[PDB]
Every structure is written in structure tokens, then in C-alpha cells.
């Protein structure tokens, strides 16, 4: 199949530019429970770009469809939570459409190994 380095090479600049698309970093780190206490009410599995790099050095991402089901939750979720009249609502419509794109070449990249 492939080598486990590259790929994961691969992933790391994948994430980087998914994070740079997040301009206001408001998916940079995990949403604070503490400050909203029914998130987990709504949403099963929390996700953010800081759990994605801890799981990508712990080997938790041998697939790219594993990487980008998890970046899907990071939007999911956001669209779930908010309300559609919110910045965040449309932040999260935002970085879908720009990390799909992303995600595209990102994901030739990979089947070329
Ligand atoms: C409730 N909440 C969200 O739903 C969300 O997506 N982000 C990014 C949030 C960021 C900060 C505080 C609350 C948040």
C-alpha cells in the first residue's frame, strides 16, 4: 500500500492549511464545557484542531477518510450547535466549502502513494 512517514508528512501540511482557513482560530481548541454546559447534551463527539494534531502523532489517522470524518465533526457539530443567524454558524459553512477544497488535493496527494 504505502509508507506510514509520508503520509503522515502529508496529513501534518493538511492540517496546517485547514487551520489557516479557521482565520479567527475559533476552531483551534476544544469548545470550553465549562462555559457552555448543554453542549454535550447536543453533540456526541467533540472535535477541534488541537484534538486532530494530538491524534495524528498518536497514530490515530492510517486513512485519509479517518482525518477527514474528523474534520466533518469540527463543521458538524458547529452547524448542530449554533443557530443558522450566527457567526459561527456561518464560520463553520465557511471552512467547509474552503477545507473541501483542501481535502480534494490533499487526498490526490495521498493516492499517489
Ligand atoms: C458554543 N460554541 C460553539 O458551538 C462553537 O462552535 N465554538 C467555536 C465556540 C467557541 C467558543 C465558545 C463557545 C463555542
Redesign the pocket.
Known amino acids: 500500500e504505502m509508507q506510514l512517514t509520508p503520509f503522515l508528512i502529508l496529513l501534518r501540511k493538511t492540517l496546517e492549511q485547514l487551520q489557516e482557513k479557521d482565520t479567527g482560530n ?2 483551534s481548541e476544544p ?2 464545557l465549562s ?2 454546559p448543554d ?1 454535550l447534551d447536543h453533540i456526541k463527539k467533540p472535535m477541534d484542531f488541537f484534538t486532530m494534531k494530538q491524534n495524528l502523532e498518536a497514530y490515530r489517522y492510517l486513512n485519509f477518510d479517518d482525518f477527514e470524518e474528523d474534520f466533518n465533526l469540527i463543521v458538524s ?2 452547524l448542530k ?2 443557530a443558522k443567524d450566527t457567526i ?1 454558524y456561518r464560520a ?1 459553512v465557511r471552512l467547509r466549502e474552503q477545507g473541501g477544497a483542501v481535502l480534494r488535493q490533499a487526498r490526490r496527494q495521498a493516492e499517489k502513494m
Open positions: 475559533i476552531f469548545v470550553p462555559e457552555v453542549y457539530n458547529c450547535y449554533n459561527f463553520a
